[PDB]
Ligand binder design. Sequence first.
Ligand SMILES: CC(C)COc1ccc(CNC(=O)N(Cc2ccc(F)cc2)[C@H]2CCN(C)CC23CC3)cc1
Length: 331
Amino acid sequence: KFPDGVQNWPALSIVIIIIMTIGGNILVIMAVSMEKKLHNATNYFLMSLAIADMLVGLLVMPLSLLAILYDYVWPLPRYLCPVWISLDVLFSTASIMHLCAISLDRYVAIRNPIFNSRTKAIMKIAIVWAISIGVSVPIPVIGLRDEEKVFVNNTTCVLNDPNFVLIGSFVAFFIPLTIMVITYCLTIYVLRRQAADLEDNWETLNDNLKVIALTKMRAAALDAQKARHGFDILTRNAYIQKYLQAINNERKASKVLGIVFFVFLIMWCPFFITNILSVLCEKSCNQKLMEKLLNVFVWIGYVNSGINPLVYTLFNKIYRRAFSNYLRCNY
Ligand SMILES: CC(C)COc1ccc(CNC(=O)N(Cc2ccc(F)cc2)[C@H]2CCN(C)CC23CC3)cc1
């Protein structure tokens, strides 16, 4: 931004999207650190994800906005177009790995449940980050070696090599997304089955108590006991509310994880479908429209990196109360 030579000033109004992308994720990072009730494997995963998304807003988004200002004619030195692209390939990938891990271990938690949690979480964070780095690192070598895989028509900074686009999309989007979807569906199936036994019998006995009838209560508690000693006596508050609250908290967490995964794939599918379709027909297609659509779908995918904190705010008292108190107390 010299600013001499700019071409699209209203694009500066995208800074708001950037400002919230960092801060919201910061609010997650401030939360999972300063709130003791957020110290666990999944919330540490979410802190890592917030770091990745804040870095998206800090490094991937601002260069894209600067390029938009100059009408997609790379305004920075030529050695920064590869880096930026690779940084994209890094941070976004981490996200789709983190979610894929969050849905995977969860499934591996439900199947065969049986170091410490706060350390195996570190191991998984390291694994997903290393995968992201391994995907990102080749891009600068390819770009700085052959500047035609990262520059299109000598001015536009987009990934150009077809084989790399396809292979990276299949190994960084389609495989992680597929694992995420399959694991989440199997998880949400098994959870319903395990919960079903207790909730059906409990509903039977609760309805029979609601009448006053009483003869229809004993077998319900028998079946619930079979599925510990809170039902053998039968009072309703303690053991019922204890085990029933544990099930429902899990249901809420499953809803949140599904919403995060689903916002992610909904917001990133347009860009990926459009790109792999722009290469499915290297000719015979209208490439101008493909590029113009991709220039907006890329930012939809970017904006996905600032929505998960709002999901936490909408479905967590801890995160919401954190965010409010952090905003007012710190400044
Ligand atoms: C040399 C090979 C191994 C690595 O080469 C690769 C090629 C493509 C991909 C798929 N990833 C993307 O298409 N992204 C990042 C992304 C990453 C992960 C996601 F889950 C979503 C998007 C877009 C995002 C928008 N940027 C402007 C350009 C882009 C970088 C290309 C990954 C690796």
